Design a protein around this nucleic acid. Sequence first.
RNA 1: AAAACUUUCAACAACGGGGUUCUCGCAUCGAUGAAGAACGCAGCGAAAUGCGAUACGUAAUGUGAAUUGCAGAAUUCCGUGAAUCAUCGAAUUGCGCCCCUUGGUAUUCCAGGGGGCAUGCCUGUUUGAGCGUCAUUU
Length: 159
Amino acid sequence: NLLRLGVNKIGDIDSKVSSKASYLLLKLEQAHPNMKSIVIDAIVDIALRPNADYHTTYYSVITLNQTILKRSEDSVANKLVKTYFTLFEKFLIDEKNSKLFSALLTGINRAFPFAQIPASVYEVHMETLFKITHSSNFNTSIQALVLINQVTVKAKLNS
RNA sequence: AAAACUUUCAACAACGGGGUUCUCGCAUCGAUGAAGAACGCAGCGAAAUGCGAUACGUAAUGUGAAUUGCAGAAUUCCGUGAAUCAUCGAAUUGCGCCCCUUGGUAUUCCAGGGGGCAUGCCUGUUUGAGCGUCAUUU
């Protein structure tokens, strides 16, 4: 219940409260790595809500991006990559969008190592990633190119 | 896997916020449609032409079966009558009458062509009518 309240305050109206909640959640993960999966699940529980609101999901994606991953946490990384892709399809389906895509690409790049997902999953979004590379915000195109390079290398596409 | 987050600048992007009345001066009117307005007008039209809210028009006169891209009226058609018809002096498309001349089986009926005729009033010419009055054996 305490975690529910704390992660609920990610979607607060005031950006200061959301930032404080994100910082405290990241501190909580560091203090107790074992609850990292529970914290990530709780954050996912809000970001995917039908009434999530752009502020809440944006700060939640930031918090998920700033999580730390180890080479034995494939389940957590496999959770995070799928969550990022689901959110990406949710919002793709502009300036506010560009920042959220930047953060989502950052998260997918962070979690693409440590993630044992079939390459075919990324192949579905590959064209979409290229659509980002010519986007208005170059900060998104950098991360899109990073993701494209990583997927191409691991999947051994023609490149 | 070096970025995020807060704050302040800075851009860039959203979001955002003719009438009516009063006063002043000037003096110039036309039955031939002024100045000004505007739907653009035709049953359905763009230009051309025509017109003015009576708006491809209204009235009057003439002609006589159309208009036409489509639709639709019809003209009781043997005529009081269409026509984006004509003339034009001011849908009423109102209400009419008769004469002259030729033909088609022609005494009936029909078809052409031409010509007048609205009414009222004044003057004068002509023609008649009245049991109105009257003369009428040089």
